[PDB]
Design a protein around this ligand. Structure first.
Ligand SMILES: Nc1ncnc2c1ncn2[C@@H]1O[C@H](COP(=O)(O)OP(=O)(O)NP(=O)(O)O)[C@@H](O)[C@H]1O
Ligand SMILES: [Zn+2]
Length: 682
RNA sequence: CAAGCCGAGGAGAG
RNA sequence: CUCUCCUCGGCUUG
């Protein structure tokens, strides 16, 4: 391992106590300075006959294996014992015991918190911080309100204040936070920015920040920025299609008699549709809620039309209505006035919309703009042409990947492309799996795919190869994502583009984040040059305030929903105001999954075979007689006992009918009994 | 590989 | 404070 000139000075105070933060730019060898500090700490604690254990904390799963393979093990295999832990191994089970060996631990975080609270809640073995001598951290800037890793530090600070009251002493460990930039936390002034930086430093018990300032030229030579760049377009033709949908929506409303006080093709209208649906369901009146459920789909179609082709919206709708027709046929294998009206309104115009959509006379601007942007680079760079795209949604990524596969020009220039999204199981899309992600990364590194389409997955964590033409298509989150993307593009003649529309304030937000970036550095300078006594005074005040802001939050949120009422309810279907279950019939397995095993509920539903699995069904999707999907099948002890949700159902209390929607099971106060086979059997 | 439970952060709009 | 979008983590059934 090598010791750069400028990494030295930033690391230097850490080597003798002095818990600190380190903010360097991106690509400056952050992991490697971590490694060096580790080796020093351990060699030191050996030379003094003192036990030395370092633990690395990360936020993601892949960075653990990552750092185990590339940085820590290749250099410290020979002197010390290393390991890498996560939620995707089997070493989680005896975590108190791996500590008894393996002087270098890498870990996902909440492993640790689980073990601490197990030591402090049950009679398990567990662990405390006293069994360490260093905590290294990646991505400092997540240390904010009740995240994970701040429990850790609130406990560290609690014990530190115990030590300080003792002084007027357990040996507490050392802490070394590493980041790219701690970030201004949503503050409209330089002073509140300062306050936020100090809040971070208190939540890490720091002594300084240690930005590089002296050996700066070596950085500028070894490390460089891309060039910021904007590309803007404007559109007022909307020629056949938009109005062809606004007509439909207007017709539906004037069939429903609901006045939005708002516009078509935006986000407030959506919120109205939601609360109207929820109200109609709490009341029970149809003709309003199902229509709302469709209007939401139309609004989504218009929003994606603002960014994506008409054909993608037409397809989105085709999928929706095709599914609904299949549902009604599976049920009927009756035809209310509502659904009949809606279908008759849609399918008559289906062929028209298909004709209007395929019309290259007016496709879109931003797509053409990025066409020009992309072709410029891949004509310039010629087989060293890596590429990245950022967008907001997942469906957009599928659409863009499809298009770049379809249009000949992009394939001509060697533009081999793949999509990428996250593994969260929500949001009406089939997510990806970690394996597909890692494979795509290795394909990018290999060179199979020249450009990647991504959501906010790409701006942090996983280690993509250095790039050229990072762009930004309809996304401005905050300064952090801005800088982290801005730190991808090495490989000279790099850029950082932003592609937006005219009448949607985005360049606004881009500029705001630029000013925030320029502000946090001023605040860093304000605090590094702060006097030590005043700095100490302020961090002590903030640590006290943070620990007091925990206690209160603890006092008002012990349970907040505790009234356990076994069967005081009835669960109805939300589409059709129809009985489905009572609360007594329901039970729980492994105190997590809710389920019912009475034959009355058995006969009411229908199973529609899986499209997720076709990409032999194992987990059927339930539907009603009406058509509203309810749940999913489940296999407990071979019993195909069918699970369910509480997002599609409605509640009716027996007393006075404040019917409510909950969106998930924990929110409601009442408790349900555990399962046991004594019922239906014996 | 599929299903689901809980928690957390960020951003928009209101 | 609510809704939507996005990401992440831990945990269970198969
Ligand atoms: N001190 C060092 N000496 C030699 N090579 C280094 C050093 N630090 C980093 N490298 C090289 O830089 C690459 C890994 O470091 P780097 O690119 O900073 O990854 P990183 O830690 O993820 N940067 P970042 O994305 O900001 O966290 C490899 O090609 C290493 O060979
Ligand atoms: Zn129903």
């Amino acid at each position: 391992l090598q010791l750069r000139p400028y990494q030295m000075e930033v690391a230097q105070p850490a080597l003798d106590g002095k818990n600190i933060i380190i903010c360097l730019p991106t690509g400056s060898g952050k992991t490697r300075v971590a490694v060096y500090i580790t080796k020093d700490h351990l060699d030191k604690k050996k030379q003094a006959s003192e036990s030395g254990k370092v633990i690395v904390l990360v936020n993601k799963v892949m960075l653990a294996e990552q750092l185990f393979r590339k940085e820590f093990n290749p250099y410290l295999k020979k002197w010390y014992r290393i390991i890498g832990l996560s939620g995707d191994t089997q070493l989680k089970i005896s975590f108190p015991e791996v500590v008894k060996s393996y002087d270098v631990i890498i870990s996902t975080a909440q492993i640790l918190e689980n073990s601490l609270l197990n030591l402090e809640s049950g009679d398990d073995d567990g662990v405390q911080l006293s069994d360490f001598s260093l905590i290294i951290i990646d991505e400092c800037h997540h240390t904010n309100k009740e995240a994970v890793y701040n429990n850790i530090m609130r406990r560290y600070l609690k014990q530190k204040l115990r030590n300080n009251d003792l002084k007027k002493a357990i040996p507490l460990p050392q802490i070394l936070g590493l980041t790219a930039s701690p970030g201004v936390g949503a503050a409209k002034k330089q002073s509140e920015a300062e306050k936020h930086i100090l809040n971070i430093c208190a939540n890490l018990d720091a002594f300084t920040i240690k930005t590089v300032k002296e050996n700066l030229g070596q950085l500028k030579h070894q490390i460089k920025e891309p060039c910021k760049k904007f590309v803007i377009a404007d559109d007022t033709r909307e020629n056949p299609f938009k109005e062809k949908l606004l007509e439909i929506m207007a017709s539906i409303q004037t069939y429903c008699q609901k006045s939005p006080m708002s516009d078509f093709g935006t986000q407030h209208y959506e919120q109205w549709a939601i609360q109207m649906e929820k109200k109609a369901a709490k009341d029970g009146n149809r003709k309003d809620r199902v229509c709302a459920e469709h209007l939401r789909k139309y609004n989504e179609a218009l929003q994606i039309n603002d960014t994506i082709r008409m054909i993608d919206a037409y397809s989105h709708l085709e999928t929706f209505y095709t599914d609904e027709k299949e549902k009604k046929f599976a049920v009927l294998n009756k035809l209310d006035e509502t659904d009949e009206f809606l279908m008759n309104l849609f399918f008559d115009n289906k062929k028209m919309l298909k004709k209007l959509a395929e019309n290259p006379k007016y496709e879109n601007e931003k797509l053409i703009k990025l066409r020009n942007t992309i072709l410029e680079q891949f004509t310039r760079s010629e087989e060293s042409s890596r590429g990245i795209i950022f967008t907001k949604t997942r469906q957009s990524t599928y659409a863009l990947s499809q298009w770049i596969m379809e249009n000949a020009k992009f394939a001509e220039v060697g533009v081999k492309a793949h999509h990428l999204i996250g593994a969260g199981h929500s949001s009406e899309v089939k997510p990806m799996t970690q394996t597909e992600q890692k494979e795509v990364i290795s394909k990018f590194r290999t060179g199979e795919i020249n450009l990647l389409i991504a959501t906010t997955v790409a701006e942090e964590g996983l280690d993509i190869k250095e790039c050229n033409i990072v762009i930004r298509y309809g996304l401005v989150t905050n300064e952090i994502a801005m800088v982290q993307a801005r730190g991808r593009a090495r490989a000279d003649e790099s850029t950082y583009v932003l592609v937006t529309s005219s009448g949607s304030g985005v360049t606004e937000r881009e500029i705001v984040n630029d000013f925030r970036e320029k502000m946090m550095y001023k605040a860093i300078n304000r605090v590094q040059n702060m006097k030590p006594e005043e700095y100490a005074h302020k961090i002590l005040e903030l640590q006290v305030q943070s620990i007091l802001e925990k206690k209160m939050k603890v006092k008002r949120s012990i349970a907040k929903q505790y009234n356990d009422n076994p069967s005081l309810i009835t669960l109805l279907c939300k589409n059709c105001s129809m009985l489905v279950c009572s609360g007594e019939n329901i039970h729980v397995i492994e105190k997590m999954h809710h389920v019912n095993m009475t034959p009355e509920f058995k006969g009411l539903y229908i199973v529609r075979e899986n499209k997720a699995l076709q990409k032999y069904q194992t987990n059927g999707e339930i539907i009603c007689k009406c058509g509203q999907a309810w749940g999913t099948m489940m296999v407990h002890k071979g019993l195909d006992l069918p699970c369910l949700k509480i997002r599609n159902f409605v509640v009716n209390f027996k007393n006075n009918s404040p019917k409510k929607q909950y969106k998930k099971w924990v929110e409601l106060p009442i408790r349900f009994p555990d399962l046991d086979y004594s019922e239906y059997c014996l």
